[PDB]
Write a protein that binds this ligand. Structure first.
Ligand code: HEM
Ligand SMILES: N=NC(=O)c1ccncc1
Length: 291
């Protein structure tokens, strides 16, 4: 399948900065959600899950089609809880009905990362809604109960290498696991709505114990009240992953730069950009705009 980016008619940087701003202002306003974590983490996860269905072999799934809007995909057991991100974006889509669903889901993630003090993530427009029959089947998102070999192999389908995998997983600085959603419970760290390299520092510095949670699933727990999924913990069990974890734990700027590249790549997988497509946009934060 070939998916060619097509700019929403007549729209330019200024139009998308307005959409960014509306998302960012609502992120500020709706501050009570999930015990005052806010919608930042769930928006990042939404961007990731809507992109992470991609299969490099046949170009099925991916961010282009905005297919999460269809029942098969929004009811994916892997997507439990993402309805909160979708509901958040509903009034944004109402105000800006011209933006494609794929553009909105991916921009939601970019906006959340930046507003939570993360790196700038260049973002390109032009994803185009595709019909219901293009919705990828359930089961393309990764299991949490597996090891490093599983993680490495899984991410090859998304054309991600070891460095890209470890960088992307640092998004687990954000939010938490929710028992009723995924069968895991707890945050990965303390500053749940600030984008930092805390995931790597916690992996290396906390004293982890392999325990069973109330859903009868194993997770690694620390006395600080943090947790790690088996797949997170695998990043320090595998010697190749471990080196990269140590790298990011010791260099905030390097982690920011690598995450930005990997996250843009994730959000752009499957999309053909014409030679005369606009350059990627780098949106100003509300803080940068004095808003
Ligand atoms: C091996 C790969 C991964 C696995 C197995 C995994 C698994 C999970 C699970 C089980 C949850 C908890 C869901 C819940 O109960 O609310 C979660 C949350 C989350 N994931 Fe991951 N994930 C992976 C990779 C990623 C990537 C690549 C990103 C983005 C770059 C990401 C971003 C997030 C965020 C921000 C949350 C918190 C959501 C919230 O607080 O509502 N994850 N993940
Ligand atoms: N990315 N994978 C997930 O979010 C997930 C993993 C395991 N169980 C539910 C959801």
């Amino acid at each position: 399948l070939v998916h060619v980016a097509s700019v929403e008619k007549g729209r330019s940087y200024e139009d998308f900065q307005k959409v960014y701003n509306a998302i960012a202002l609502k992120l500020r306003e709706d501050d009570e959600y999930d015990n005052a974590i806010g919608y930042g983490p769930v928006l990042v996860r939404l961007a990731w899950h809507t992109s992470g269905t991609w299969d490099k072999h046949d170009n099925t799934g991916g961010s282009y089609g905005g297919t999460y809007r269809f029942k098969k995909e929004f009811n994916d057991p892997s997507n439990a809880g993402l309805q909160n991100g979708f509901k958040f974006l509903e009034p944004i889509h109402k105000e800006f009905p011209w933006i494609s669903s794929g553009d909105l889901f991916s921009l939601g993630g970019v906006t959340a990362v930046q507003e939570m003090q993360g790196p700038k993530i260049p973002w390109r427009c032009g994803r185009v809604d595709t019909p219901e029959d293009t919705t990828p089947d359930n089961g393309r998102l990764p299991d949490a109960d597996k090891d490093a070999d599983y993680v490495r192999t899984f991410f090859q389908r998304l054309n991600m290498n070891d460095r890209e995998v470890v960088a992307l997983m640092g998004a687990h600085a954000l939010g938490k696991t929710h028992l009723k959603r995924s069968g895991y419970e707890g945050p990965w760290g303390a500053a749940n709505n600030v984008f930092t390299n805390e995931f790597y520092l916690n992996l290396l510095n906390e004293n982890w114990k392999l325990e069973k949670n109330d859903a009868n699933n194993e997770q690694w727990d620390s006395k600080s009240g943090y947790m790690m999924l088996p797949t997170d913990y695998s990043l320090i069990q595998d010697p190749k992953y471990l080196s990269i974890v140590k790298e990011y734990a010791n260099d905030q700027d390097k982690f920011f730069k690598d995450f930005s590249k990997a996250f843009e790549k994730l959000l752009e997988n499957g999309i053909t950009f014409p030679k005369d497509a606009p350059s990627p946009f780098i949106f100003k934060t509300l803080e940068e705009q004095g808003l």
